[PDB]
Write a protein that binds this DNA or RNA. Structure first.
Lengths: 96, 167, 197, 183, 127, 106
RNA sequence: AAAUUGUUGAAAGGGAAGGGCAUUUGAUCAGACAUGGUGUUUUGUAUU
RNA sequence: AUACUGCCAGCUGGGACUGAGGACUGCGACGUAAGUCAAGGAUGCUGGCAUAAUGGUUAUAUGCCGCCCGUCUUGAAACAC
RNA sequence: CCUGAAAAUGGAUGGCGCUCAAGCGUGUUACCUAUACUCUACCGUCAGGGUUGAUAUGAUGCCCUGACGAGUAGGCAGGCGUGGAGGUCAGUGACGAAGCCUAGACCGUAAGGUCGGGUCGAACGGCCUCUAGUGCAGAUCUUGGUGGUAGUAGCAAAUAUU
RNA sequence: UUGGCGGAAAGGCCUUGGGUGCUUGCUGGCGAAUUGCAAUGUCAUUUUGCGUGGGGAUAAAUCAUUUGUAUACGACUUAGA
């Protein structure tokens, strides 16, 4: 299996965005800013990538992250991982 | 001192050579090389070009011409080992060739002090080229496609096998 | 000769083809071998499976990660044959092996290019009719290669596209054949026939 | 006088030297190679940071069976140390060389340590007592330290050789033909 | 300017270096015959250093002849050119390393007067 | 024209050698399109060039040449023996050489 | 002086290094002048 | 007739390596006297360069090969010293 | 060909690999290459021989011909190098001797010899002879010096310092 | 310039309409020489550097401090305008 592309969400929580940093406090928090700029339009780079994932990509996995602000740990850095979707067709998985 | 002397001394005069027993005899050209044969040059500035062969000079070289009018090769001498004699022949009758010789191809060697770091044709030579090439084109024009043949150069294409190619 | 020679690995016997292409690599030919799963081996399938299990039994006792690395893909089986036939521990052998590229199926760089055959390695010509033989894909999948089916479906896709291209080429060639038949029977065609073309 | 092989000019250079320095030659070599080629003021700041354990001398040659430290990360190595004594000796010599450069009238802001070198001084010997009534050596490895600071300048090489060229008659004819053809 | 002799052929321009002179510093490079019982060099196994043999000897006609064709001859004063005088096409002078600069200049002048070629007409003189 | 080659392509195969000793003084050349000694006999006594490139120009060119010639046929399969003025550098085992058509007999 | 070492410079380095034969590549280097002078179009006119 | 075998002091080609010697002498061959010759060892004509171009030394790369020497021993790279 | 046919690290027709073979038996040719054979060049050794005559010349010379060349232990020969001695070069040298450094040159098959460059500062060399405390990689050699190991083992008994 | 198709490593393959050059499909005119009888007789570069201009957006990581889900030392997991 080879990853074709990863489509992301318009707004990323600061908890998950903290995962992409090793020194988050001393940073400009520039993370997914240009991706969100690519967002706010219908399908300039989003619906087309999802159509690519539907046309190809026999396996689709959803990227998720944990709500560790809710969890009582001192972490504040969301664990983000991949969970495979195992039902329906590729189109159904992608639009799910 | 540092070195006293040698024990004995040999002779000192230049040695005369023995009477060499090698006589120069005229070269026997390969049978394909008859005057009027169309040759293709294999090396030099005019490599691959198709010329006609006029006369075998006395210094074992062959007199060729393009003619200059068709392909731009002037009256030159070439080595018989750097040409390919072809089947096609043009009758070189009606052209005078007895004028050309090594004396005709004098060079006037450049000086040793003339080192070209930053540093033409005689009218008589251009006139002989013109007259010979006129009398030669007068013959070449008769058979079709030969002027085009001589103008076009020769080269090996992919898949050409010289050991199978009949020139 | 050519810059790259691409060999359709189907129907070739592994050893004969490996000797051919090893000599070609040493002589300086760049060789790419596609369709390595359709590459044959003489002998019964069970016999060749026993040979591979005998190979699989060999590994450094004190550390199995230093011992022979038994590759399972058909392209890697053919590559191991070739590397045995090349003097791989010298710089020249390393260069000759770098000139080689083996594949299962026909990847995109080479599915659009001519594929040749080495007839002195071909099973139909070499083997006696009725003599048993194995297939490298079946052997590989039996000994632990996990991409037999995906390669099969990609191969079917490639077959379909190639057959469409071939039908188009046939139609165009037929139209050109009709055109040259009509424009033919001319002085030029007659003189070319008299000249040998 | 008579330092090591230097490629600079004494007009824009100052020197310092210290011989028979009872400091470890190996730790001193590592410290010298650490500050080698640096700006003088930057190297002085680095040496005081090493004394404060904020940074380390990377041990590159004499480092067998020494420990690992995150402070080696900035130098690309894993084995770095904090040789207080050799650092103090080296920065004493650095201040001496800066004094000499000021005396000679050198800008002192673009001074950089162009040359630094430490080799083995004659050893100082003592006795150590082993089991079963044996004597072994207990020897210091003093250092000869020397250094040269000089002013930074621009690229020092230009105006290459004439590069005379010799062509044959064929090559000269080809060049002339190409020149006549080209427009 | 000089007689055309037979071509100067050197059968072995490589130096015969003593075995293991590369391996050990105590073993000097000057050739020594290996006389060990098991020595691969003495036994002439394939792949080992070549041993000096009389078959490498130089042509009698070109022996002791330098590249120019002159045999080299040490001189220490103007007097020795006086036995080299009439043999300029077969003999070359060579000033001893011990000659002072003034005597070296005087020997050079004498050789230049006599047409004698000297093998080091560059020592102790500037550009 | 688009094709300008006046020579024949060949490849420098190896030195003359036994199982475990080689002779750098004679190299083996494979002529393209020849597979028989009767075919190679045509190229017998023909000049060969190894043309290579160096990054430093010397005599106005960055291209250097080693000249040699085809001496005799080798083996049963159209390989020939060739001898060059300087032996080929053994990194060219499999490098292309040019077999010219001179000296000519046709 | 050597072993041994520092610095600088050059080069190589996939479980040693070193060596022989051969070439290539880089660096480095020796070796033929103008010497008698039939030509003399030339200075301190027998001084090239 | 051809095949096969033998012979030819039969003919005609293609390619490679070598050029030792340095006045004459000898054995010859062809010629008609005289001369000439492939006959007791290469000459003729031509070109480029005349300088690191050829070459030497050196370091590296490459192809092949190369076990650590001394010793005692029938036998040593030796897990013999 | 198969069964008889069982051994211990993983494993060896040398390896890959080979099945109308790249296996087995036989036959026919072509081809590859040893320091062997043939033919040349050159080196040395051995043998057989030529060579009187006068200036400018050595007949311990010059030249012709042929054959041959493996070697431990061992024998002999011809040479190279070192300290000192007789003779000689009316030798080199403070205007730089000796020594030492130098992937600079030349010569000799080699032992080695000569020279260029740097350092140095008071002696030294060529040739004919004489002489010996005369040539080193080894001897668990002798004396001195220096390494890798290695900034390593370690500097932890006797309560404990701030 | 348009419409496409190709995810196996697609990184390529088609296609619409225009600008422009050549055309040896068939006939002409001029030029070529002298590189001297050959010398590869220099014609291709996922290189790099230094320059010019047509655009384009203006971060992190490490050390240090800290954590203990970790830890011999590194490393790991945290936090910190």
């Amino acid at each position: 299996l080879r990853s074709l592309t990863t489509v992301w969400a318009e707004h990323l929580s600061d908890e998950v965005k903290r995962r992409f940093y090793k020194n988050w406090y001393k940073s400009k928090k520039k993370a997914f800013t240009k991706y969100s700029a690519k967002y706010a339009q219908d399908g300039a780079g989003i619906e087309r990538e999802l159509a690519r994932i539907k046309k190809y990509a026999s396996v689709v996995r959803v990227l998720v992250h944990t709500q560790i602000r809710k969890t009582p740990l001192a972490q504040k850095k969301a664990h983000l991982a991949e969970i495979q979707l195992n039902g329906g067709s590729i189109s159904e998985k992608v639009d799910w | 001192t540092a070195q006293q002397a040698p024990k004995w001394y040999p002779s000192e005069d230049v040695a005369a050579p023995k009477k060499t027993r090698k006589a120069v005899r005229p070269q026997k050209l390969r049978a394909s090389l008859v005057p009027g044969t169309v040759l293709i040059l294999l090396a030099g500035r005019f490599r691959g070009k198709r010329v006609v062969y006029l006369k075998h000079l006395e210094d074992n070289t062959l007199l060729v011409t393009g003619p200059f009018k068709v392909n731009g090769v002037p009256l030159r001498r070439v080595n018989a080992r750097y040409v390919i004699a072809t089947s096609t022949k043009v009758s070189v009758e009606g052209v005078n060739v007895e004028k050309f010789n090594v004396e005709y191809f004098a060079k006037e060697k450049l000086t040793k002090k003339e080192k070209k770091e930053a540093n033409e044709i005689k009218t008589e030579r251009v006139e002989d080229q013109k007259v010979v090439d006129k009398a030669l084109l007068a013959e070449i024009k008769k058979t079709p496609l030969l002027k085009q043949y001589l103008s076009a150069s020769f080269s090996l294409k992919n898949g050409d096998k010289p050991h199978l190619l009949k020139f | 000769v050519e810059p790259v020679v691409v060999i359709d690995g189907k129907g070739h016997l592994v050893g004969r083809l490996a000797s051919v292409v090893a000599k070609q690599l040493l002589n300086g030919q760049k060789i790419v071998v596609v369709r390595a799963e359709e590459l044959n081996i003489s002998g019964e399938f069970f016999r060749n499976k026993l040979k591979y299990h005998d190979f699989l039994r060999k590994a450094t006792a004190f550390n199995k990660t230093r011992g022979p690395f038994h590759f399972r893909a058909p392209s890697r089986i053919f590559y191991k044959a070739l590397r045995g036939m090349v003097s791989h521990k010298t710089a020249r052998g390393k260069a000759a092996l770098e000139r080689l590229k083996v594949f299962e199926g026909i990847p995109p760089p080479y599915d659009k290019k001519k594929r040749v055959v080495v007839p002195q390695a071909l099973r139909v010509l070499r083997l006696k009719p009725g003599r048993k033989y194995t297939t490298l894909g079946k052997l590989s999948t039996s000994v632990g290669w996990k991409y037999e089916d995906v390669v099969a479906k990609l191969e079917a896709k490639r077959k379909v596209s190639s057959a469409e291209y071939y039908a188009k080429k046939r139609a165009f060639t037929k139209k050109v054949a009709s055109a040259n038949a009509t424009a033919a029977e001319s002085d030029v065609a007659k003189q070319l026939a008299a000249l040998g073309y | 006088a008579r330092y090591g092989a230097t490629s600079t000019n004494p007009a824009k250079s100052a020197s310092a030297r210290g011989s028979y320095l009872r400091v470890s030659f190996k730790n001193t070599r590592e410290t010298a190679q650490a500050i080698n080629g640096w700006e003088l003021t930057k190297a002085q700041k680095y040496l005081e940071q090493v004394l404060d354990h904020q940074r380390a001398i990377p041990f590159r040659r004499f480092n067998s069976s020494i420990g690992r430290t995150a402070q080696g990360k900035e130098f690309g190595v894993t084995k770095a140390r904090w040789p207080a004594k050799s650092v103090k000796f080296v920065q004493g010599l650095l201040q001496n060389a800066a004094a000499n450069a000021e005396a000679k009238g050198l800008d002192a802001t673009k001074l950089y340590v162009s040359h630094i070198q430490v080799n083995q001084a004659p050893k100082q010997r003592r006795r150590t007592y082993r089991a079963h009534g044996r004597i072994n050596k207990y020897e210091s490895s003093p250092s000869h330290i020397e250094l040269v600071v000089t002013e930074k300048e621009e690229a020092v090489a230009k105006a290459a050789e004439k590069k005379v060229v010799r062509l044959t008659s064929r090559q000269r004819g080809r060049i002339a033909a190409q020149k006549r053809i080209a427009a | 300017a000089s007689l055309p002799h037979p071509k100067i052929v050197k059968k072995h321009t490589k130096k015969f270096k003593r075995h293991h002179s590369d391996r050990y510093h105590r073993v000097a490079e000057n050739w020594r015959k290996q006389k060990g019982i098991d020595s691969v060099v003495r036994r002439r196994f394939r792949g080992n250093i070549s041993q000096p043999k009389i078959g490498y000897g130089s042509n009698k006609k070109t022996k002791f002849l330098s590249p120019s064709g002159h045999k080299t001859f040490l001189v220490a004063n103007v007097k020795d050119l006086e036995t080299l005088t009439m043999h300029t096409k077969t003999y070359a002078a060579e000033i001893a390393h011990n000659i002072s600069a003034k005597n070296r200049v005087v020997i050079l002048a004498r050789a230049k007067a006599l047409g004698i070629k000297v093998t080091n007409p560059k020592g102790r003189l500037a550009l | 024209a688009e094709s300008h080659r006046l020579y024949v392509k060949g490849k420098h195969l190896s030195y003359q050698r036994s199982k475990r000793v080689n002779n750098p003084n004679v190299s083996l050349i494979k002529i393209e399109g020849v597979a028989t000694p009767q075919d190679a006999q045509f190229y017998l006594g023909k000049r060969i060039a190894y043309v290579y490139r160096a990054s430093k120009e010397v005599r106005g060119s960055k291209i250097r040449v080693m000249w040699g010639k085809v001496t005799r046929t080798h083996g049963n399969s159209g390989v020939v023996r060739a001898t060059f003025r300087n032996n080929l550098p053994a990194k060219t085992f499999g490098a292309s050489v040019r077999i010219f058509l001179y000296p000519s007999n046709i």
